[PDB]
Amino acid sequence: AVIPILVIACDRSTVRRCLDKLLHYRPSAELFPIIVSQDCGHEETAQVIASYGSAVTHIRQPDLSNIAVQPDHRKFQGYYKIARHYRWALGQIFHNFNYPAAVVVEDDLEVAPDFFEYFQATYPLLKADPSLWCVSAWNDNGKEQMVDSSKPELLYRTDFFPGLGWLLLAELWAELEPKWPKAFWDDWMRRPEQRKGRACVRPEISRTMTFGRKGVSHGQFFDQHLKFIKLNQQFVPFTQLDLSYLQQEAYDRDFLARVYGAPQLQVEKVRTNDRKELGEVRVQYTGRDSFKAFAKALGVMDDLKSGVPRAGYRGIVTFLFRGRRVHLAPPQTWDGYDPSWT
Ligand SMILES: CC(=O)N[C@@H]1[C@@H](O)[C@H](O)[C@@H](CO)O[C@@H]1CP(=O)(O)OP(=O)(O)OC[C@H]1O[C@@H](n2ccc(=O)[nH]c2=O)[C@H](O)[C@@H]1O
Ligand SMILES: [Mn+2]
């Protein structure tokens, strides 16, 4: 199966950093053709992409007109342009080139040495399990002190769509295109009407890292969070590993049994590093306020999209804190997300 890498670009010449790493690590030009879709028309960026010659296929979004935004969105024209470009580019991949799947990579992402190996290994899982709707290279809680460097091979399921280096099947584009939004496509994906209870595979250590401090947005989120996401540098031969543990049946039984079988500790004890003999614990939250309070106390992301926490799975956020494995989890009676948890 051929899995193209669709690179989304606009007006940053640093797309060079992105393409250099993709081309350096690519194991096969035939199995992983690179298609660079460029919006905007920025001449210098176009010349940079063109300089790679036949190593990539350069396509150009055709409609460079301004978009009529709704009354609440005067400040957000750029987000409307991002959504328009995604719809056109994905249409080229799935309707024109007619590929079976694709890995979407924004121009300000640097990939890890095992980026291709990771997607090659997980594609069959995505094809076989309809409860999965994507595979992502991104760990939303992937800061250095929050991940286990001794387990670069460990993967998880997450209900929180991460994007930022992600694989989708042509089958999913068939479902999304007819209702593609005018703006904020990532948060639109995160809504239950789109997600329909499906999960993505995500890693313990991220296979992408963004360097786009300057972009469409204000550098706030980048400066406070994104810049700290660690890029994996230890090559893991995922295609040689047994990933059967990620199938829904196995995961929902074993991973959940692991989380709820682990000893419970009060957040304060985890914070101060008490009871260190307990290498894996559960910190229970019971409502929106306690979730946010406990997430912040332990240094993890505390925002929610449609009621789902960053990297959460059945409400559980899993990470490392001062060397200890911690599962910030709801009571075992959990039965669905509440979008009102904002
Ligand atoms: C870290 C993070 O979560 N970033 C997400 C991004 O993944 C997502 O797609 C976007 C959806 O609203 O929200 C932010 C944007 P954010 O990450 O803040 O901003 P940017 O990198 O500038 O833009 C995202 C992508 O859109 C492209 N672009 C930009 C301007 C334009 O007119 N046309 C165009 O196609 C860029 O080349 C880039 O590939
Ligand atoms: Mn960006």
Swiss-Prot record:
It comes from Oryctolagus cuniculus (Rabbit). Substrate binds at residues 12, 39, 85, 107, 217. GO terms for biological process: in utero embryonic development; mannose metabolic process; protein N-linked glycosylation; protein N-linked glycosylation via asparagine; UDP-N-acetylglucosamine catabolic process. Belongs to the glycosyltransferase 13 family. Residues 1-342 are lumenal. Disulfide bonds join 10-40, 134-200. This is Alpha-1,3-mannosyl-glycoprotein 2-beta-N-acetylglucosaminyltransferase. The chain holds residues 106 to 447 of 447 of the full protein. GO terms for cellular component: Golgi medial cisterna; Golgi membrane; perinuclear region of cytoplasm. Mn(2+) binds at residue 108. The active site is at residue 186. It comes from the Eukaryota. It is an enzyme of class 2 (transferase). Pathway: Protein modification; protein glycosylation.
